[PDB]
């Protein structure tokens, strides 16, 4: 049992909240330990495992096992307290310093993220901070993909972080309250500002690499939009209208995406699916275009 | 300032207790040279006196190390040289069958000293020490995570260990298959421990620059959270 590990997890949270450590270097270590701990606790299991455990509890027909759920609950309580405090510290920190330590802190934020999805965090986090900052950072994401060539190097830093940021955004969108916060932050606006979509990627390093990369950005952002759309009530709701505007305004890209090949094709294929999901999920983009 | 004197006193006194305890175990000692114990219990002693007289002649490397911690002696060469001796001494006693046994004892010895020093970087250069340990243990059977686990137990945080280790990873021009494995074990150890990190993007991870955290950092931010420590 990684019970012994639990104590270290507590110490880590303590130090972070305290934000002692002149070195972000120190905090990077704390973030790394926390990341592993969160990951370790839930060995890759998916909703099926949870459903099986619930049934067994079903009810305690005899002696049940509910060990992993119990462990997750304890982790989440600890984390909550310490949490509000530490969320503040973790996000601010974020930005700066450490573009480095960043790779570590964004990964920590994402793991944490699943668990403690649901709950808790959405409220806290919401507010603050994050949203504002993260949406603005979408705009800047577009700019950051170009700056991407330069910095291929400084890339190492940022791949660990930028990808982590997209993931964090996608995860927030997966749930109702999270999607609402992102959308409130003016996601569509930042995306319009990034101008990632309102262009043609082909227009324009070995060229297939750049296409893979650009399309890659498009697939994640497109997933974030689709997830935000569906995650609310995609119908009469306001969300449906916003997504439709997204499609029409960035039409012809959707159409253009539909045919061709490579790993680039693979990325293209995923992008195509993502648009399709956006389409049906909304009022059928086609349906709207009666 | 009274407090200042009192605490220093407690620290030095503790050292004598440790030295005293070891003297009992040590078989190099003669009972009639009880005089040493009388001296130890009798009063606080000069650090240099403790170091030169006791630690070196009785080869208590651990004690010497702890003492220099209190002294706050920074000199890396001397500190490292002392470390080399401790490691070398450890090799002598070992026989091989106890790869695991020695594995434990080794971890035990290191963790204890590590807990005392780990707070300060001079005696416990995490960066310098980790490889040194791996290198030492390398001439032994291996299971991944054996090296890092000791540091975690030592009192080192998951976050601290991660950044330094990553640096070790990227910094080295080389194979470091070992580091990759251990870090792999570290991440796995960490995620399970906190609920915060927990889940699926992970299992795939088999240590590379495919840092799960690295990706996380890029998107959300570097802010992991507060330091996470082993319970």
Numbering used by the authors:
A (entry chain V): 1392 to 1595, 1607 to 1692
B (entry chain W): 1139 to 1312, 1319 to 1375
Sentences from the paper on this structure:
Nuclear pore complexes (NPCs) create large conduits for cargo transport between the nucleus and cytoplasm across the nuclear envelope (NE). These multi-megadalton structures are composed of about thirty different nucleoporins that are distributed in three main substructures (the inner, cytoplasmic and nucleoplasmic rings) around the central transport channel. Here we use cryo-electron tomography on DLD-1 cells that were prepared using cryo-focused-ion-beam milling to generate a structural model for the human NPC in its native environment. Our findings highlight the inherent flexibility of the NPC and suggest that the cellular environment has a considerable influence on NPC dimensions and architecture.
The inner ring (IR) is centrally positioned at the fusion point of the inner and outer nuclear membranes (INM and ONM, respectively) and forms the central channel that connects to phenylalanine–glycine (FG) repeat proteins that create the permeability barrier and facilitate active cargo transport. FG-Nups (Nup54, Nup58 and Nup62) are docked to the IR to create the central channel for transport. For the IR, we first docked the published composite model containing Nup93, Nup188/Nup205, Nup155 and the Nup62–Nup58–Nup54 complex. Although this model fits well, some elements appear to be shifted, suggesting that flexibility in the IR Nups may account for the larger diameter that we observed. To better fit the model, we isolated individual Nups and reoriented them locally to create an updated IR model. In our IR model, Nup205/Nup188 (paralogues that are indistinguishable at this resolution), Nup155 and Nup93 are significantly shifted, whereas the Nup62–Nup58–Nup54 complex is stable. Propagated through the entire IR, these rearrangements explain how the central channel becomes larger. The Nup93 and Nup205 subunits of adjacent IR structures form a pseudo-lock-and-key configuration in the constricted IR model; by contrast, here these components shifted to create gaps between the IR subunits. Adjacent IR subunits are nearly separated compared with previous models in which the subunits were snugly aligned. However, the diameter of the central channel is considerably different —it is about 33% larger (width, about 57 nm) compared with previous models (width, about 43 nm).
